[PDB]
Amino acid sequence: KVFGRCELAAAMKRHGLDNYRGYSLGNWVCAAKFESNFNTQATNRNTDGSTDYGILQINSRWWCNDGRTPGSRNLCNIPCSALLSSDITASVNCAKKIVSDGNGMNAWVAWRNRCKGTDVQAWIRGCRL
Ligand SMILES: [Cl-]
Ligand SMILES: [Cl-]
Ligand code: NA
Ligand code: NA
Ligand code: NA
Ligand SMILES: [Ru+3]
Ligand SMILES: [Ru+3]
Ligand SMILES: [Ru+3]
């Protein structure tokens, strides 16, 4: 599923991401825009052999099991395919664990390079929240 901008903002708010670990809703929408273009089915292989999955490009090196990332962890206790569903629950719940691990949203390279320090509130402008 490719979400609309305001549709995803609303879904993320329902699932408790607005101000989660202090990160306003616009940060999460911005991160999803640049990680996946709001496409739940996005997958991208990393140089180390791991793969990033879903709207927030969650990495199999640490967070989910894809059966093909030797020596990796599965800290969200989910198959990586669960991060590709039209229902964003699994991605949101795993993202909550990631953002709580110490480095905040810096875990997401696209957030660090394209959202951090910007007027992220623009990503939710006009949306009925
Ligand atoms: Cl559409
Ligand atoms: Cl957009
Ligand atoms: Na919320
Ligand atoms: Na893994
Ligand atoms: Na509100
Ligand atoms: Ru469309
Ligand atoms: Ru729309
Ligand atoms: Ru758009």
Swiss-Prot record:
UniProt catalytic activity: Hydrolysis of (1->4)-beta-linkages between N-acetylmuramic acid and N-acetyl-D-glucosamine residues in a peptidoglycan and between N-acetyl-D-glucosamine residues in chitodextrins
A single GO BP: defense response to bacterium
Domain of life, per lineage: Eukaryota
Keywords: Allergen, Antimicrobial, Bacteriolytic enzyme, Disulfide bond, Glycosidase, Hydrolase, Secreted, Signal
Disulfide cysteine pairs (residue numbers): 6-127, 30-115, 64-80, 76-94
Binding sites annotated in the UniProt record for substrate: 101
Gene3D superfamilies: 1.10.530.10
GO CC list: cytoplasm; endoplasmic reticulum; extracellular space
Function: Lysozymes have primarily a bacteriolytic function; those in tissues and body fluids are associated with the monocyte-macrophage system and enhance the activity of immunoagents. Has bacteriolytic activity against M.luteus.
Miscellaneous information on this protein: Lysozyme C is capable of both hydrolysis and transglycosylation; it also shows a slight esterase activity. It acts rapidly on both peptide-substituted and unsubstituted peptidoglycan, and slowly on chitin oligosaccharides.
Name assigned to this protein: Lysozyme C
